[PDB]
Amino acid sequence: QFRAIIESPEGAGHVGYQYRRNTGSTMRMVSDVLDERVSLWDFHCDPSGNVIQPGPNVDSRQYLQAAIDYVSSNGGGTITIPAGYTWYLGSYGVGGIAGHSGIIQLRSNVNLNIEGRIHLSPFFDLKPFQVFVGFDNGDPASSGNLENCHIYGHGVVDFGGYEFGASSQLRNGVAFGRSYNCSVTGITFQNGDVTWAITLGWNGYGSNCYVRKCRFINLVNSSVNADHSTVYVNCPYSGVESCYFSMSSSFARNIACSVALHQHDTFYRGSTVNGYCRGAYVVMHAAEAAGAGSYAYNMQVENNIAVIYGQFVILGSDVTATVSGHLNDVIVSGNIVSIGERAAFSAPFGAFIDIGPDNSGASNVQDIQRVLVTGNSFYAPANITDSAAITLRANLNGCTFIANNFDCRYMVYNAPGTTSPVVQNLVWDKSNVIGGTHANQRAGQNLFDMQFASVVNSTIEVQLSCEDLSMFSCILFPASCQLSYSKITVDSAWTKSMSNTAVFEGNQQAGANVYVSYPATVNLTSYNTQGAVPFFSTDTNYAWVTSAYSLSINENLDFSPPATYTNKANGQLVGVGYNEIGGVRSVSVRLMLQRQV
Amino acid sequence: QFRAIIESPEGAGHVGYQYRRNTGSTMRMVSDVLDERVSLWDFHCDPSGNVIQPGPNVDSRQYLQAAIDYVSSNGGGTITIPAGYTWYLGSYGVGGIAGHSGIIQLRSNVNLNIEGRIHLSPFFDLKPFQVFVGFDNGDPASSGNLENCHIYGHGVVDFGGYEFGASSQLRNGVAFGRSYNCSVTGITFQNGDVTWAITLGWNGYGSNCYVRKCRFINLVNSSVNADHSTVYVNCPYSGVESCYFSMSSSFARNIACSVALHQHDTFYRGSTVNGYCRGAYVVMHAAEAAGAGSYAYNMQVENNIAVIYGQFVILGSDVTATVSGHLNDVIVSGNIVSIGERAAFSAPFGAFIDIGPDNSGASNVQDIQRVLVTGNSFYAPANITDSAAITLRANLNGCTFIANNFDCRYMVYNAPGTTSPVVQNLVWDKSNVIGGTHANQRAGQNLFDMQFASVVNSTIEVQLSCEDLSMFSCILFPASCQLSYSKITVDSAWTKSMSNTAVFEGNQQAGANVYVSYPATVNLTSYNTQGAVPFFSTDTNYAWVTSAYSLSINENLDFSPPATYTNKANGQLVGVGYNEIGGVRSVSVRLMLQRQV
Amino acid sequence: QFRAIIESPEGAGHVGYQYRRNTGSTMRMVSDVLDERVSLWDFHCDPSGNVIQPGPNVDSRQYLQAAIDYVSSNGGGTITIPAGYTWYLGSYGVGGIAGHSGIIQLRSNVNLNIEGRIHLSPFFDLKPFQVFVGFDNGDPASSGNLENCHIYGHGVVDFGGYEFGASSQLRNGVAFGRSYNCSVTGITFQNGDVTWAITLGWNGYGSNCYVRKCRFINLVNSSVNADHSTVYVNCPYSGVESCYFSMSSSFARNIACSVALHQHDTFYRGSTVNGYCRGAYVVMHAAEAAGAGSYAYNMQVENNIAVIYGQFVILGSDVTATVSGHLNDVIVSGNIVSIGERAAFSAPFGAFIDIGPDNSGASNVQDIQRVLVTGNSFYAPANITDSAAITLRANLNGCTFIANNFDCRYMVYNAPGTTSPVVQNLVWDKSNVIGGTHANQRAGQNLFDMQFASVVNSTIEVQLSCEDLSMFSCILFPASCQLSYSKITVDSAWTKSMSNTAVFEGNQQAGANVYVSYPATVNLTSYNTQGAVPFFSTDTNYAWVTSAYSLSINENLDFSPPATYTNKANGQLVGVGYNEIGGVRSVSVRLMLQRQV
Ligand code: NA
Ligand code: NA
Ligand code: NA
């Protein structure tokens, strides 16, 4: 009677309890207290209610779904996935997540505390999957929201090492969906060939979604995998902090990016990356602009550590038939980034910043401006010819560089022939320090290679900190690049032996609102006159020069050339020196040529 | 007999347990294991011990207080506020928190894990309240400390949307009191009209208090609300990290600040703000200097993202009859900040840094120095006339600006008439990049408007990066501003067409220890002499000029003006050019005027 | 019968339970649910299974070890150390941790949630100890790994205040061993005289180990203690974030460092330090290079707040018979650091950066390069003569300084006599702001004191922001320092009254590839000639000068000196001025001397 009730499932509901024997505390039953927590064990049972042990040959999916569905029905809670066990998933979910190749459906206010391990069984080999899906509809546009869903703990999600079956397939760990106040904290995602580990939001719908203190380990493994971004941030007021990302496959060096920031007010901070092609995309895709507008603004990449093989930050924006995307108000700061040991040209072109074309290769759709790149370090090994502070491959409406340290082959680069970007407001402050690792490697190359259609309202203040006499020039403009309302200077330090410092193939430095200064060697010849006497340049290509001054000592006693020069209508320089004794003088002098500065 | 004991409240204390059947484990009873945790359910009961369900019509306050008081009596623990329920509070607390309009009294070592929702009932409508109070006395000065108290979880505190009843009232979420090692992590505070969500410390008493990963949503809603700072940090070695703050009301744009840092060794990092008037106050109030001294030092605002309507960082210090407050050793870095879309003058004057007067409007009490503002971005839309890198409205003893990007109407500003601050050690390094969003908007305005009583030991190195010919001047000193032992330079780039570059209305640039350089147009006339021949300025206002040099080309063949000039006692410039053929020459030239540089 | 089973230890395993009466949930027993968690109470029992109360006279060690060992046997879990109790440890462990003076042995996948207090009993007074040890062997080289071990909670580890018995002894809180994915979060370590609180890794073996939100309070207390680094990071992909470190003893000001970063891809962020000698070591020790290679790279110290008495960041690398250590790719950024109030020379020499000799004092073994120091603030009080931006005491292969604010006695320093470092690639950008706290204190001192064997490929761009006429020179090279392929400039602002600006005791500024500019006063005398007329310097020590220009006004009406000068073979300067009326002129002028700039 009483014995029977006690051994029944209702037994615990008949045993009284009062907290610490406190007479002022609730008189409850044991079952009530045990009902304050919930684990997968409370649903991991056969139809008669007997517990099932997890393992390689047990598909845990329906049991976890039942737990989620039930806790959802009570307004939420946290389900623990117990430590000490590996819980295998072995079949697809059903309903609104089947269109997403979903395994488990997440539900609002239902948190998962993953302390044990979740493993994918070989049912998923060569197939698509998205392990945790927060959509409730096959069509994301008719999906409801996922709110207040947190996954956390010390546990693991293991994708079982299976390769993709076909490049067209997609694979994900956590697809939060149209997600609001959702997060992943503490979890290790490992051992896969996937497209993403976590995606946050859906085409701008969502808010307040975060990935923190997670580890992502070896999540690309095959030539079949088309592309990878480990965390894809597709809702605003969201981001990634204090994570670790590591890949070891060769394929990852060519296709994988750690983070993609695709909506406004998003961030990527304090994370360490190794073995990836790319650091972060920061891109406003017009096809993803439904939920939070057409502008990506307030984008922050800060205080990360990366060894990569391709590009650290990739900026973009694009358009559709009905929507134009814009990118502005970005800060990239405090990051320390290297291109890993590799042969030149063996992975995508190495870059700290890349201004990339759209997915169809168009370089004339972008609207990127008000970007600040400051207080970062970049290094590439001396053999990596394809390394640049910025590869400027598409139209740019502004990017400002202050107080960085760049130590790679090029400072500014774009390939000739290719795209001919239209450039406005590119600012390279004199406080950017140009390293010398690539000294002596730059035969035939221009340090700032300005292979653009045009440059306007831009500043390039070149300052070397060691010699590199192998380079063709410090900065070169082809004749095809228009240049106006710009300031281009080359500091003389470490330049005395350079044949070419600044080169303007179309004589663009003569423009009315071009402000330039650079060293040049000039031959001069004086009149015979004893006393104050003019010296004039033998060459006539200085009609643009507003002043020039001596960078050379005067080895002579009997005369001195002018310290300073102006020009004449015929393009000669002229200055007044001094003949202590008369005679025609002929000298070769290093001058700082200046125009309007 | 046995049946009776088992169904009694002591029943669980009669059922044996040994962990996982391990014979080396303690032989315990069920009640002992259940006593390892505690929830509000263990106290949320009527006088007969029957559990009460929470809800809109149940006042949960006495039950939560009883739980806190009891756990306190045992040396501490963590009380869980269960998920899946909304727990309403409906009356004020009693005792030492009644003077603070307290609801719940916090106690040392007693943590709250808020997984469910705490809601305020309409009893609090139009009234003051402070939901959680750590003071044990009505008079904070005779209060004991609160130590080792942490509030955390995925839950919510909802202030029920009630407006303030009167501007004089105060409202708070968590008043920690004289708090040591206390924190709030993970909680969402929403739906209110309050003064603060969380306050840390009391007039410098406290230490090691933090707010992390909390969200603060819509916490100002009425014209009645006098003021708001979401987190007020009033103890040292304390701060705010990785939080989200969002307001939507119009009133918030005029009164709300996200954080106030009021004691030394405090920080505000990695947080995102939207819809606020202000970012952070960083202020040493002499009236709050009892617990940690008279100095606010080691103040850090870093790596935040903000869209605001007024000022990002507001610096101050003030005095009382017996105490003077000082502010020094501050760093503001890596932040990306915008003034939101708004009409000019429709909210408090937009600023990245504001040096504010005291609460009584006094601008002659402040002692603010050794501030570093570096590697930040600031943007204001082109129509916002009231936008400045710094509004310098009170005495300043030092502020240093390096490697920022400011894109707004003014760089340095203070309104004329108003306060006449005394300025020392203002440093504006050439590495600050001046954006061009406000180009063409600056009719009648000075980019650096130096409306001060005096400027000493200061550096302004102005560098433009595009043209703006609408501005009256790059920098202007009224005749009322003394200027000494200072360096003021205007780079020539994008200045060739400017009528005025630097303006010194009192001819202050002639001071003995003033070091200045800027472009000017000058008319000159030569002697008739063939050969080396002097040119002299027609105007006599260059007695302060130590050298000048040509910024113009020479369109002539038969002569050249001097490349470089010095002056004469009468205030003319003079240099030696060259007449190939003789004749009096008359030319108009753009020169860089220099004094002691 | 049934009564007997129920009161036995197996009783709970006979009482049925089904979660919330849900008929689809597992039919379990109470014991199963209680077995989901585990605490120290489940092992803190006598041999008959009766629970023992912890306290001062109970040694809790064997019971905690038994708990750890058992949970380990089940594949892991989290053991809670209950709140409300102090758990004393009173004897050493046995087995593989005895060689490490271990107390408790940590085991893989076994987490400790420390909510209560762990205290050391006086058995440990005057003895060595390491409280938690992750090694399983006395010899670390034959030790197995510790993986997936996390210690966290709101609890405390108290070292009981005992002094060290002898300087040779070692003491530690948590020695993780060869540790992979291990962490400490939330814990307060206090009240000791120890060598370290936490060590991560062993001679480069380990990965993904972190210390977050921990507090470290008063952990050095005696003159006996040889040395202290609070967190020692000796494995890669590891670091310290958001911690608090505080010492109050005088001894700590001379021996204690907060963090030591000893392997690649390690970081120290967002932490606050007070009362320590040092901030962080960043050092590649060749004796510790077994597990992760010979290079420390990707080292990050960012956004910390410190008041220290010695040096903030200390860089090093050294060698053994068979291994050479290298240090490169380091970033030190956003930190705000002060030397605390102290007498000059009363603690180790104050420095923001120190390039230190090896432990045997050798300054010729180091290979340190590609370091970026940017956007930091440093302050030392005016009386602290021993304060420097960088003490450069050992060979340096590169360090770059951009956009810092340094306000201390020296900018660059090394003591004369002592080491004679070989310096390459030291870069001091003009954007570093030199504060004026030490103005008037620098009698007999050189601001940049270049006491080196040699300097190559280096840049020193000195910019003052106030006067300090007490200093002997802005920069001085002794004749013993070679200088080549370098750029050394002194901006003229605030220098007009300085006798010496740049000093080159060996006339090193004449070198072929030395690029220098600085102010000097020069006496000149003209010829008699009316009209354009040469002026020449009376002194002949300007054979290295390529140009010079006037920094002085001309008080004369009847003549003007040249605005600009070049030199002559005999070392005189010469320029062409203008005599309106003839006569020999004699003037004393302030010039900017330039060489190849
Ligand atoms: Na073109
Ligand atoms: Na005045
Ligand atoms: Na030497």
Domains along chain C with CATH numbers: 1-78 (6.10.20.90), 79-511 (2.160.20.10), 512-597 (2.40.30.250)
d(C-alpha B14, C-alpha C4), whole Å: 11
A79: its two tokens: 């389900």
Q: Which residues of A fall within a CB distance of 8 Å from B501?
A: none
Query: Resolution in A for the shown PDB structure?
Result: 1.8
Buried residues in C361-386 as b, exposed as e (16+ CB within 10 A):
eebebbbbbbbbbbbbbbbbbeebbb
How wide is the angle at C-alpha B282 spanned by C-alphas B281 and B283, nearest 5°? 100
d(C-alpha A276, C-alpha A249), whole Å: 9
Cβ of B16 within 8 Å of Cβ of C8? The answer is yes
Using alpha carbons, select from B131, B5, B13, B12 the residue that is nearest to residue B65.
B131
d(C-alpha C345, C-alpha C450), whole Å: 20
Please give the C-alpha separations between residue C27 and each of A73, B107, C33, in angstroms, as whole numbers. 20, 40, 11
d(C-alpha C304, C-alpha C593), whole Å: 41
| Residues B489/B458, Cβ–Cβ less than 8 Å | no
d(C-alpha C574, C-alpha C562), whole Å: 8
Measured in Å, residue B451 CA sits from the centre of ligand 2 at: 9
Q: Is B433 on the interface with C (CB under 8 A)?
A: no
Instruction: Count Cα atoms within 13 angstroms, Cβ side, for B486.
Output: 24
Question: Can you tell me whether residue C19 is helix, strand or coil?
Answer: helix
Give the full edge-to-edge strand order of the sheet including B454-456.
B422-424, B454-456, B482-484
DSSP string of B501-549, one letter each residue: SEEETT-GGGSTTEEEEEEEEEEEEE-S-SEEEEEEESS---TT-SEEE
Q: Residue C321: left if φ>0, alpha if ψ -120 to 50, beta else—which one?
A: alpha
Burial level of A444, CB count in 10 A (0-12/13-18/19+)? exposed
Listed as own residue / partner, the contacts of C68-75 with beta carbons closer than 8 Å and 24 or more positions apart are C68/C104, C68/C105, C68/C106, C68/C107, C68/C110, C68/C112, C69/C107, C70/B22, C70/B24, C70/B25, C70/C43, C71/C38, C71/C107, C71/C110, C72/C107, C72/C108, C72/C109, C72/C110, C74/A84, C74/B20, C75/A83, C75/A84, C75/A85, C75/C109
d(C-alpha B85, C-alpha A74), whole Å: 9
Question: Can you tell me whether residue C77 is helix, strand or coil?
Answer: strand
Please give the C-alpha separations between residue A147 and each of A96, A202, A266, A478, B271, in angstroms, as whole numbers. 17, 13, 18, 55, 21
Q: Is A586 on the interface with B (CB under 8 A)?
A: no
d(C-alpha A150, C-alpha A147), whole Å: 9
d(C-alpha A474, C-alpha A434), whole Å: 11
| Pairing assessment for the beta strands C486-490 and C473-477 based on DSSP bridges | unpaired
| Residues B324/B294, Cβ–Cβ less than 8 Å | yes
Cβ of A8 within 8 Å of Cβ of C16? The answer is yes
d(C-alpha C429, C-alpha C459), whole Å: 7
Number of H-type helices and E-type strands within chain C: 4, 53
Q: Which chains touch B (3 or more CB pairs under 8 A)?
A: A, C
Q: Which of residues 523-582 of C touch A (CB under 8 A)?
A: 529, 531-534, 543-549, 562-570, 574-576
Using alpha carbons, select from A525, A520, A523, A521 the residue that is nearest to residue A579.
A525
B159: its two tokens: 């202030």
Give break positions in chain A: residue before each, C–N beyond 2.5 Å: none
Cβ of C568 within 8 Å of Cβ of A560? The answer is yes
d(C-alpha B572, C-alpha B551), whole Å: 18
Measured in Å, residue B505 CA sits from the centre of ligand 2 at: 12
Name B245's bridge partners: B216, B273
Q: State the ligand closest to the CA atom of C505.
A: 3
d(C-alpha A192, C-alpha A190), whole Å: 6
d(C-alpha B573, C-alpha B529), whole Å: 18
| Residues B225/B251, Cβ–Cβ less than 8 Å | yes
d(C-alpha A232, C-alpha A174), whole Å: 10
| Residues A387/A343, Cβ–Cβ less than 8 Å | no
d(C-alpha B529, C-alpha B543), whole Å: 25
User: Which DSSP letter does residue B162 get?
Assistant: P
The dihedral built from the CA positions of residue B56, B59, B65 and B70, taken in this order, carries a sign that is negative
**Termini Cα distance of chain B:** 103
Using alpha carbons, select from A61, A559, A335 the residue that is nearest to residue C300.
A335
Please give the C-alpha separations between residue B321 and each of B204, B294, B324, C34, in angstroms, as whole numbers. 18, 13, 8, 63
Please give the C-alpha separations between residue A267 and each of A243, A330, B312, in angstroms, as whole numbers. 12, 10, 19
The dihedral built from the CA positions of residue A579, A584, A590 and A593, taken in this order, carries a sign that is positive
| Residues B146/B110, Cβ–Cβ less than 8 Å | no
Q: What are phi and psi of A281, to 5 degrees?
A: -85, 140
Please give the C-alpha separations between residue B554 and each of A541, B495, B562, in angstroms, as whole numbers. 14, 19, 10
DSSP string of B49-69, one letter each residue: S-B---STT---HHHHHHHHH
| Residues B280/B310, Cβ–Cβ less than 8 Å | no
Using alpha carbons, select from A544, A415, A551, A422 the residue that is nearest to residue A496.
A551
Using alpha carbons, select from A29, A26, A192, A14 the residue that is nearest to residue A118.
A192
d(C-alpha B229, C-alpha B280), whole Å: 8
The dihedral built from the CA positions of residue C132, C137, C141 and C142, taken in this order, carries a sign that is negative
d(C-alpha A518, C-alpha A495), whole Å: 9
Q: Which residue has the tokens 């070692």?
A: C170
A479: its two tokens: 């004749």
Using alpha carbons, select from B382, B398, B417 the residue that is nearest to residue B390.
B398
Cβ of A570 within 8 Å of Cβ of B551? The answer is no
Length reported for chain B: 597
DSSP H or E run through A42: none
Q: State the ligand closest to the CA atom of B452.
A: 2
Cβ of A33 within 8 Å of Cβ of B38? The answer is no
Question: Can you tell me whether residue B478 is helix, strand or coil?
Answer: coil
| Residues B171/B181, Cβ–Cβ less than 8 Å | no
d(C-alpha C344, C-alpha B434), whole Å: 42
Burial level of B27, CB count in 10 A (0-12/13-18/19+)? middle
d(C-alpha A212, C-alpha A232), whole Å: 14
Binding residues of A for Ca(2+): 99
Q: Which residues of B fall within a CB distance of 8 Å from C307?
A: 298
The dihedral built from the CA positions of residue C72, C76, C82 and C87, taken in this order, carries a sign that is positive
Q: Which residues, at least 6 apart from B550, have a Cβ–Cβ distance to it below 8 Å?
A: A546, A547, A566, B561, B562, B563, B564, B589, B590, B591
| Residues B420/B478, Cβ–Cβ less than 8 Å | no
Minimum Cα–Cα distance from A270: chain B residue: B270
Taking every pair of Cα atoms in chain B, the longest distance, rounded to a whole number of angstroms, is 133
Q: What is the 3-state secondary structure (H, E, C) of A152-168?
A: ECCCEEECCCCCCCCCC
- How close is the nearest chain C Cα to the Cα of A572, in Å? 20
Q: Which residues, at least 6 apart from B135, have a Cβ–Cβ distance to it below 8 Å?
A: B96, B97, B99, B100, B102, B143, B146, B175, B177, B178, B202
What are the DSSP E strand ranges found in C409-453? 410-413, 422-424, 426-428, 433-434, 446-449
- Which technique was the structure solved with, according to the deposited record? X-ray
Listed as own residue / partner, the contacts of A320-325 with beta carbons closer than 8 Å and 24 or more positions apart are A320/A286, A320/A287, A323/A286, A323/A287, A323/A289, A323/A294, A324/A286, A324/A294, A324/A365, A324/A367, A325/A283, A325/A284, A325/A285, A325/A286, A325/A289, A325/A294, A325/A295, A325/A296, A325/A367
Q: Is A31 on the interface with B (CB under 8 A)?
A: no
DSSP H or E run through C240: strand C238-241
Q: Which residue has the tokens 């649910």?
A: C33
- A356, amino acid identity: G
Cβ of B405 within 8 Å of Cβ of A402? The answer is yes
Question: Can you tell me whether residue C148 is helix, strand or coil?
Answer: strand
What are the DSSP E strand ranges found in A235-367? 238-241, 244-246, 256-261, 266-269, 272-276, 278-284, 295-296, 299-302, 305-308, 311-317, 326-333, 336-339, 350-355
Using alpha carbons, select from C497, C454, C505 the residue that is nearest to residue C475.
C505
Q: Which residues, at least 6 apart from A583, have a Cβ–Cβ distance to it below 8 Å?
A: A528, A558, A559
Q: Is C181 on the interface with A (CB under 8 A)?
A: yes
Q: Which residues of A fall within a CB distance of 8 Å from C34?
A: 34
| Residues C557/B569, Cβ–Cβ less than 8 Å | yes
**Termini Cα distance of chain A:** 103
Using alpha carbons, select from A218, A250, A448 the residue that is nearest to residue A346.
A250
| Residues A319/A361, Cβ–Cβ less than 8 Å | no
Q: Which residues of C fall within a CB distance of 8 Å from B33?
A: 34, 37, 41
Question: Can you tell me whether residue B228 is helix, strand or coil?
Answer: strand
Question: Can you tell me whether residue A362 is helix, strand or coil?
Answer: coil
d(C-alpha B381, C-alpha B372), whole Å: 25
| Residues A478/A451, Cβ–Cβ less than 8 Å | yes
Q: What are phi and psi of A573, to 5 degrees?
A: -85, 155
